[PDB]
Structure formats: C-alpha cells, structure tokens
C-alpha cells in the first residue's frame, strides 16, 4: 500500500538477490530503525528545542539523566519519516556517510528551510543547531549498505 516499503519489496529485493551471492532469501538486508539525536550544544530548557523535535518525528522523545535526548522510530512511522526525507532530498545535494551497516545524515536548519510543510512555523526551528539522523540497516557489508541507499535514493531528474 505504501510507496516506500512497496518499492523495496517489489523492486529492490529481487535485484539484490540477483546482484550478490546469497544462500537464502532471508539473508537480504532490510530496514530496521531510525534514530534521531539533537546536535551537542543546545539549551535543554527552551520549549523550541522540544517542539522542533516533536514536530518532524511525530512521537515523544526520551530525556535521560536532562543531558541526553533521543527518539527511535520503527515501522510505519519510520517509513513515513524516510519517505519525507527522501522527497526533500531531491531539492539539494545533502551529504551522507555510509558506515558498515548504517547511514548517517545531518539534519540541519537548511533542511527544514527546504521542507515545504515547515515553511510555516519556522520560528520553532530557528535558533536550533540541528539533529543527527541514523538509518540502521540489517547489512553485513558497507557495500550492501551503499547499494541499498543508492537504490532508495531515487529522483526523476538527471
């Protein structure tokens, strides 16, 4: 029903079976979770820092002992967040970094400047350094992660 996971199951799984050496269909990498953590120097006190995290994630964060804030996204909320960030990715050339099994992205204020739904209420996200977004994949190899991200990052330009 939904475009992102439907596209994964219908296109990328067959091609990732065919491109690499796999002994089983359960050895194909997938998509586990998205972890969002704000950038280090911030206020802990203002309501802007809490609201600018609650709005793009869609769920309440956790604030541990006040020195750490975190949100973890799994399932259809993770899919909605990913299909938003991949659509807004097509308006610029934001850098990402591929680790051994995960993708690191830097959620700056210049991202929410280009987000069309966050053009309004922009004074929430003003005076915020940004966030760090982690995309965890069930990948054995950094090249599997790179192939999976290159599959997921699609546009109609070029």
């Amino acid at each position: 029903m939904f475009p992102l996971n439907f596209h994964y199951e219908d296109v990328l799984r067959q091609d990732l079976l065919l491109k690499l050496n796999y002994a089983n269909v359960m050895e194909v990498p997938g998509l586990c979770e998205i972890r969002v953590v704000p950038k280090a120097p911030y206020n802990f006190i203002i309501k802007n820092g809490k609201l600018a995290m609650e709005i793009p994630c869609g769920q309440k964060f956790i604030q541990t002992q006040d020195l750490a804030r975190q949100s973890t996204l799994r399932g259809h909320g993770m899919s909605n967040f990913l299909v938003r960030i991949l659509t807004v990715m097509s308006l610029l050339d934001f850098p990402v970094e591929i680790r051994k099994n995960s993708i690191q992205f830097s959620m700056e204020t210049e991202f929410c400047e280009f987000s069309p739904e966050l053009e309004d209420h922009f004074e929430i996200f003003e005076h915020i350094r940004g966030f760090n977004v982690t995309i965890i994949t069930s990948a054995n190899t950094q090249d599997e992660t790179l192939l999976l991200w290159s599959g997921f990052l699609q546009k109609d330009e070029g």
Binding site: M1, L18, D120
Partner: protein
C-alpha cells in the same frame, strides 16, 4: 563439443503505479488511524492560527492528477510503454531464433550465440545492442544468469545440436520509446499475455517471471 550456448535478455519495464490494495488492509489502515487519533495530543487553535493567519489567494492553479487508465489501455494499443500501468511489461520481438524448426517467424527474446567474449554478460549487451541500437536508457542487473534452459534432441527432432540458453535481466531506465531493429515486429506484453503467447514454455516462465 557441446558449445554454441546462447545468451538471451529479458527486457522489462517496471510498474509505474502501485496496484490496488486489499480492501481489508485499506479498511484496517483507515480504522487504525482514526482510532489512534482519539488518544493523542490535540494542538491549540492559537497554534494553528499561525498558519491560519497565513491564508492567502495566489494565482490559483488547481492540480488534477493523471488517470491510472490510459488511452493505450482502452484502445488495446500494443508497442506502447504507457499501457498497463500497474503491471510490468516485457519486450518480445518477431523473427528467426537460433532454433531451426522452420523458416517461419516466431516470438522470442533478443539473443546471441556466444563465440569469443569473456562473459555472457558482454554477449548479452551486444545482443540487446543489435536490437535497440544503443545502450543509454538501459540497466543490466547481475553478472550471473537468472535462469537457464538446456535443449536436447528428442524423438521428433534429431537434427538440431544440443545447446543451452541463458537468460539475463535488463530494465528500462527512463525512455518511453525505442528504435527496435533487426526484427520484423515487436510488442510490450505482460506476464499473462506472455504466457498466452507461449503455451509450451508456460511452466518454465511462470517460475522465471515473478508476478
């Protein structure tokens, strides 16, 4: 001795649109959203009045979406990459294959007999080149064949030599039109239409093509 293996190519167009979901799945998704709305925080109207104060009338341009049913679908126009949007399309040409049962033309996939290449990969890109002219709007997947078919003589036909046919897979990238040559005719057909055109290889192609 046993030689003259052929490389064939499966040329595909993927789905443009999402197929129709199951009504039970759609009903549960709608119900789940409406039921979970009851237990969630409701933002104040003064907070939504920031966007209500940004209510304006531009040069209004209304968005009308393209229909999922195409004129090619309703006119049964083959050789078109605009019909059958929610299914996949496959390229079939018309001419003489390597099989020499007769001189008459028959539907088949593009192919080439291997002579001196390092890879059947490299054989298959040349086989597709000889059909569509050029290799700019295509994407070949895998260095390994997705399926094979070994043809041996039988009691009705002892003349053709034993040979293998290896299928590789290629996908349309962005083009909606191609210049198809080295054939009499061509078509863009689905999995079910491919099975209707091929009564004798239906068992093999049902497992080879995933619906």
């Amino acid at each position: 001795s046993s030689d003259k293996i052929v490389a064939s190519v499966l040329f595909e167009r993927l789905r443009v649109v999402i197929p129709k979901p199951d009504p039970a799945v759609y009903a549960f998704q709608e119900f789940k959203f409406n039921w979970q709305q009851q237990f969630r925080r409701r933002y104040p109207d003064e907070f939504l009045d920031i966007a209500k104060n940004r209510a304006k009338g531009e040069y209004q341009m209304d968005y009308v979406p393209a229909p999922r049913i195409t004129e090619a679908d309703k006119n049964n126009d083959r050789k078109s990459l605009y019909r059958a949007l929610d299914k996949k399309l496959y390229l079939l040409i018309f001419g003489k294959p390597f099989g020499a049962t007769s001189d008459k033309p028959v539907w088949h996939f593009p192919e080439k007999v291997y002579d001196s290449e390092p890879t059947l990969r490299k054989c298959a890109e040349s086989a597709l080149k000889s059909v569509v002219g050029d290799l700019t709007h295509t994407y070949f997947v895998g260095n390994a064949p997705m399926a094979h078919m070994a043809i041996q003589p039988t009691e009705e036909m002892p003349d053709l030599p034993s040979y293998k046919r290896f299928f590789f897979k290629c996908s349309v990238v962005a083009a909606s039109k191609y210049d198809i040559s080295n054939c009499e005719d061509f078509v863009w057909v689905t999995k079910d239409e491919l099975l209707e055109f091929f009564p004798e290889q239906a068992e093999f192609f049902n497992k080879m093509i995933i619906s």
